[PDB]
Design an enzyme around this catalytic site. Structure first.
Site, PDB file in Angstrom:
ATOM      1  N   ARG A 174       0.799  -1.212   0.000  1.00  0.00           N
ATOM      2  CA  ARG A 174       0.000   0.000   0.000  1.00  0.00           C
ATOM      3  C   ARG A 174       0.840   1.273   0.000  1.00  0.00           C
ATOM      4  NH1 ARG A 174      -1.665   0.515   4.146  1.00  0.00           N
ATOM      5  NH2 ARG A 174      -1.476  -1.374   5.417  1.00  0.00           N
ATOM      6  N   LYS A 229      -8.422  -2.871   0.806  1.00  0.00           N
ATOM      7  CA  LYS A 229      -8.332  -2.016   1.999  1.00  0.00           C
ATOM      8  C   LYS A 229      -9.070  -0.696   1.883  1.00  0.00           C
ATOM      9  CE  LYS A 229      -6.075  -4.749   4.631  1.00  0.00           C
ATOM     10  NZ  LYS A 229      -6.591  -5.217   5.946  1.00  0.00           N
ATOM     11  N   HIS A 264     -10.409  -5.282  12.136  1.00  0.00           N
ATOM     12  CA  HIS A 264      -9.306  -5.787  11.336  1.00  0.00           C
ATOM     13  C   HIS A 264      -8.906  -7.041  12.102  1.00  0.00           C
ATOM     14  CE1 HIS A 264      -4.938  -5.425   9.718  1.00  0.00           C
ATOM     15  NE2 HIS A 264      -5.712  -6.023   8.831  1.00  0.00           N
ATOM     16  N   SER A 271      -0.380  -6.244  10.250  1.00  0.00           N
ATOM     17  CA  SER A 271       0.143  -7.081   9.177  1.00  0.00           C
ATOM     18  C   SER A 271       1.292  -7.971   9.640  1.00  0.00           C
ATOM     19  CB  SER A 271       0.619  -6.196   8.021  1.00  0.00           C
ATOM     20  OG  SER A 271       1.127  -6.983   6.960  1.00  0.00           O
ATOM     21  N   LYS A 319      -2.724 -13.334  11.925  1.00  0.00           N
ATOM     22  CA  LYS A 319      -4.173 -13.458  11.833  1.00  0.00           C
ATOM     23  C   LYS A 319      -4.591 -14.568  10.867  1.00  0.00           C
ATOM     24  CE  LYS A 319      -5.297  -9.075  10.715  1.00  0.00           C
ATOM     25  NZ  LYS A 319      -3.894  -8.622  10.559  1.00  0.00           N
ATOM     26  N   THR A 320      -3.908 -14.635   9.725  1.00  0.00           N
ATOM     27  CA  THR A 320      -4.195 -15.632   8.699  1.00  0.00           C
ATOM     28  C   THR A 320      -3.630 -17.004   9.012  1.00  0.00           C
ATOM     29  OG1 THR A 320      -4.452 -13.998   6.934  1.00  0.00           O
ATOM     30  CG2 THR A 320      -3.952 -16.222   6.248  1.00  0.00           C
ATOM     31  N   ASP A 340      -9.490 -11.509   7.755  1.00  0.00           N
ATOM     32  CA  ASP A 340      -8.981 -10.137   7.820  1.00  0.00           C
ATOM     33  C   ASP A 340      -9.932  -8.971   8.140  1.00  0.00           C
ATOM     34  OD1 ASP A 340      -7.826  -7.663   5.783  1.00  0.00           O
ATOM     35  OD2 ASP A 340      -6.427  -8.576   7.197  1.00  0.00           O
ATOM     36  N   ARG A 373       2.275 -12.267  -1.945  1.00  0.00           N
ATOM     37  CA  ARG A 373       0.950 -12.689  -1.533  1.00  0.00           C
ATOM     38  C   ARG A 373       0.303 -13.654  -2.504  1.00  0.00           C
ATOM     39  NH1 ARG A 373      -1.562 -10.138   3.414  1.00  0.00           N
ATOM     40  NH2 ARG A 373      -0.105  -8.438   3.892  1.00  0.00           N
TER      41      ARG A 373
HETATM   42  N1  ADP Z   1       4.668 -17.972  15.662  1.00  0.00           N
HETATM   43  C1  ADP Z   1       4.099 -17.423  14.593  1.00  0.00           C
HETATM   44  N2  ADP Z   1       2.777 -17.088  14.614  1.00  0.00           N
HETATM   45  C2  ADP Z   1       2.236 -16.538  13.526  1.00  0.00           C
HETATM   46  N3  ADP Z   1       2.817 -16.243  12.355  1.00  0.00           N
HETATM   47  C3  ADP Z   1       4.145 -16.583  12.367  1.00  0.00           C
HETATM   48  C4  ADP Z   1       4.829 -17.158  13.411  1.00  0.00           C
HETATM   49  N4  ADP Z   1       6.153 -17.369  13.072  1.00  0.00           N
HETATM   50  C5  ADP Z   1       6.257 -16.926  11.847  1.00  0.00           C
HETATM   51  N5  ADP Z   1       5.085 -16.425  11.341  1.00  0.00           N
HETATM   52  C6  ADP Z   1       4.911 -15.849   9.978  1.00  0.00           C
HETATM   53  O1  ADP Z   1       4.445 -14.508  10.178  1.00  0.00           O
HETATM   54  C7  ADP Z   1       3.508 -14.162   9.169  1.00  0.00           C
HETATM   55  C8  ADP Z   1       2.162 -13.814   9.778  1.00  0.00           C
HETATM   56  O2  ADP Z   1       1.358 -13.502   8.659  1.00  0.00           O
HETATM   57  P1  ADP Z   1      -0.193 -13.438   8.431  1.00  0.00           P
HETATM   58  O3  ADP Z   1      -0.896 -14.383   9.306  1.00  0.00           O
HETATM   59  O4  ADP Z   1      -0.403 -13.434   6.978  1.00  0.00           O
HETATM   60  O5  ADP Z   1      -0.331 -11.930   9.040  1.00  0.00           O
HETATM   61  P2  ADP Z   1      -1.696 -11.146   9.092  1.00  0.00           P
HETATM   62  O6  ADP Z   1      -2.741 -11.970   8.475  1.00  0.00           O
HETATM   63  O7  ADP Z   1      -1.923 -10.735  10.495  1.00  0.00           O
HETATM   64  O8  ADP Z   1      -1.062  -9.951   8.220  1.00  0.00           O
HETATM   65  C9  ADP Z   1       3.360 -15.366   8.212  1.00  0.00           C
HETATM   66  O9  ADP Z   1       4.211 -15.127   7.057  1.00  0.00           O
HETATM   67  C10 ADP Z   1       3.869 -16.521   9.100  1.00  0.00           C
HETATM   68  O10 ADP Z   1       4.424 -17.612   8.344  1.00  0.00           O
HETATM   69 MG    MG Z   2      -3.906 -12.039   6.488  1.00  0.00          MG
END
Ligand code: ADP
Ligand code: MG
EC number: 4.1.1.49
Length: 535
Positions: A60, A208, A227, A245, A249-250, A264, A328
């Site tokens: 973004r 977004k 969010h 970010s 969350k994902t 999200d 992504r």
């Molecule tokens: N312990 C952990 N818990 C969550 N994510 C982790 C952890 N260790 C590494 N990661 C990495 O951190 C990133 C978290 O991303 P994501 O869930 O996509 O973030 P959000 O959805 O909040 O932006 C992912 O690339 C994931 O593989």
């Molecule tokens: Mg996400």
């Protein structure tokens, strides 16, 4: 169906051909057209999904975000030059808006356009009917994956509430004389109910941008706009995960034992939690099929990879971040097996989890929050990137983003905290603080250990555990939890000496205290100060 005349109303002329609500099959064919050149061009990967390049913009551009200040938005919006606290809601004149609109409509004139009608919001009573117009096939694919795809019966009586025109190929050459940040632009007009995109190809701007619109409309109706990701267990127990970010969350809501509602953006009304989207937008940097199998398996035909490195033989190098660490993949939510269907919605949430990636290595893996600490931490929205390009030696730079998503807030942060608090209260929801970030080892806590802590929260292992208070932050941490290493529950244990932890804990505490001072205008924020850290 559409006609060249309905487009002419928007200011678009000489439309050669309209591709109305293209199927996945057509989009697939369109992206693979060997005659495509530049950023429109997609490549087929061995996994069956097409990979595109968003160009210069791999994320973004908040500095180019503007909202028209007119009689509709003047007194309601959280303006960057009005309201205390830094935000990206920069005012835009109605005249400059018309100049940008002229640039975008002239750009989409005489072209073969892709028109995608979709919904933003799973519930018909609060959902927005959005009309996306673009000249780039993969951009239409992105909105098809991300938003709620209407049925034939719904498209019959479809009337757009909001229109979003993507003129990524055009730029504003008069930006310097108009006082803008750059030749690019992501503008919003609430009187015209429209979004203009120029110069940036990044699809995240459309996603977004509508989230920012829901963030404005919903709270004014008393509905929480969040969010957060969300899932439900077999017993009807819904859990929501807030966070900035890259905080998890994902990766964490995609649990094979729980039905995924969304990952999200969610709303919370009288009936419960509902998803705004029709798909997921996962991070693929250093993606491991071992650690995140459901997400890896969702990458197949119809999924849209972006900025990832595709080798000559078609294989993807998920570890390559030479272009961006923000690689992504978007995909229809149904690419995940265990999800709520047909409608992405469930009951009220009883577990609210705030995810934070603490680069300081100070916060414990998990803490049960008190009602005041819930509100204090929501408004603080802390996270810390281990930046400095990690070619220097160390640089745990923090980020305080109100409500864990300040970049998308259209109203003052407290308005979000308020509607959220009343929802948590009526549901008897409990809040927890989780550090998916770092500790004293300098290594990020494994996804395996984090998932074990999420399980301990969801099944009540945490709620029944005996807890002690962590000094300064005054967080109630468990003495022990089933499935997780006891040594990590107390952050001081991961350090050679608790004195090392102390030093940094004080630094983080001062940052929190310093940051929260912009909410001490009202008796409310001033009262919450007792819920924050104390030296
Ligand atoms: N312990 C952990 N818990 C969550 N994510 C982790 C952890 N260790 C590494 N990661 C990495 O951190 C990133 C978290 O991303 P994501 O869930 O996509 O973030 P959000 O959805 O909040 O932006 C992912 O690339 C994931 O593989
Ligand atoms: Mg996400």
């Amino acid at each position: 169906g559409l006609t060249p005349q309905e487009l002419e109303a928007y200011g678009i002329s000489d439309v050669h051909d309209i591709v109305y609500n293209p199927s996945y099959d057509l989009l697939y064919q369109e992206e693979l057209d060997p005659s495509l050149t530049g950023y429109e061009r997609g490549v087929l990967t061995n996994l069956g999904a097409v990979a595109v390049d968003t160009g210069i913009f791999t994320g973004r551009s908040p500095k180019d975000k503007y909202i028209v200040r007119d009689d509709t938005t003047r007194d309601t919006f959280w303006w960057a030059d009005k309201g205390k606290g830094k935000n990206d809601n920069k005012p835009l004149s109605p005249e400059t808006w018309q100049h940008l609109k002229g640039l975008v409509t002239r750009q989409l004139s005489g072209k073969r356009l892709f028109v995608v009608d979709a919904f933003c919001g799973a519930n018909p009573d609060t959902r927005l009917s959005v009309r996306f117009i673009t000249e780039v096939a993969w951009q239409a694919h992105f909105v098809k994956n991300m938003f709620i795809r209407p049925s034939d019966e719904e498209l019959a009586g479809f009337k757009p509430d909001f229109i979003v025109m993507n003129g990524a190929k055009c730029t504003n050459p008069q930006w310097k004389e108009q006082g803008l940040n750059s030749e690019n632009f992501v503008a919003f007009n609430l009187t015209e109910r429209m979004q203009l995109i120029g110069g940036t190809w990044y699809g995240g701007e459309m996603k977004k941008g509508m989230f920012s619109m829901m963030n404005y409309l919903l709270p004014l109706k008393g509905i929480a706009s969040m969010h957060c990701s969300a899932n439900v267990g077999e017993k009807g127990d819904v859990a929501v995960f807030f966070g900035l970010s890259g905080t998890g969350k994902t990766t964490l809501s995609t649990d094979p034992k729980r039905r995924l509602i969304g990952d999200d953006e969610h709303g919370w009304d009288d009936d419960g939690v509902f998803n705004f989207e029709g798909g997921c937008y996962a991070k693929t940097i250093k993606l491991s099929k071992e650690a995140e199998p459901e997400i890896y398996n969702a990458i197949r035909r119809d999924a849209l990879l972006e900025n990832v490195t595709v080798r000559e033989d078609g294989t993807i190098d998920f570890d390559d971040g030479s272009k961006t660490e923000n690689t992504r993949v978007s995909y229809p939510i149904y690419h995940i097996d265990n999800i709520v269907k047909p409608v992405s919605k469930a009951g009220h949430a009883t577990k609210v989890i705030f995810l934070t990636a603490d680069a300081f290595g100070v916060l414990p893996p998990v803490s049960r929050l008190t009602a005041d600490q819930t509100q204090y931490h929501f408004l603080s929205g802390f996270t810390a990137k281990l930046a400095g390009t990690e070619r220097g030696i160390t640089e745990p730079t923090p980020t305080f983003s109100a409500c864990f998503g300040a970049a998308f807030l259209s109203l003052h942060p407290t308005q979000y905290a308020e509607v959220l608090v009343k929802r948590m209260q009526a549901a008897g929801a409990q809040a927890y603080l989780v550090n998916t970030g770092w500790n004293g080892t300098g290594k990020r806590i494994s996804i395996k250990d984090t998932r074990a802590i999420i399980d301990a929260i969801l099944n009540g292992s945490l709620d029944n555990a005996e807890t002690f208070t962590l000094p300064m932050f005054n967080l109630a941490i468990p003495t022990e939890l089933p499935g997780v290493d006891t040594k990590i529950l107390d952050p001081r244990n991961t350090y050679a000496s608790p004195e090392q932890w102390q030093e940094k804990a004080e630094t983080l505490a001062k940052l929190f205290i310093d940051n929260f001072d912009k909410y001490t205008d009202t008796p409310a924020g001033a009262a919450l100060v007792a819920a924050g850290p104390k030296l």
